[PDB]
Amino acid sequence: QAMFERFTDRARRVIVLAQEEARMLNHNYIGTEHILLGLIHEGEGVAAKALESMGISLDAVRQEVEEIIGQGSQPTTGHIPFTPRAKKVLELSLREGLQMGHKYIGTEFLLLGLIREGEGVAAQVLVKLGADLPRVRQQVIQLLSG
């Protein structure tokens, strides 16, 4: 959460949107799936440009995530905590950033963090759509160059 000092405005906004996505589905946790939904919803950063560059539809990503996770049965108004794997995505995102010389990270690194996490809904969707780690890293390098 000191972590969020190294997130850009848009990446912070993705995390706010993730919490909204969880509420919209009556999920009482913010999982990898919700971070990905937030990311595609925001739709205007480097992550979104990376997906579109690869021929992956943002609408397709939402449909695949929403199909897997469906609807919860825990409406809440409280703070919605992150799942342990969602917290790991955030940590991983910072390290994806540092590997490319970015201390302050935008949405491209949340995308890479999602994928690097490997095991959750987000990674499963993205890998199945062809956004695997090596390919998205290459895309992001291209969009950051230089």
UniProtKB/TrEMBL annotation:
Residues 4-145 form the Clp R domain. It comes from the Bacteria. Coiled coil: none annotated. This is ATPases with chaperone activity, ATP-binding subunit. It comes from Corynebacterium glutamicum (strain ATCC 13032 / DSM 20300 / JCM 1318 / BCRC 11384 / CCUG 27702 / LMG 3730 / NBRC 12168 / NCIMB 10025 / NRRL B-2784 / 534).
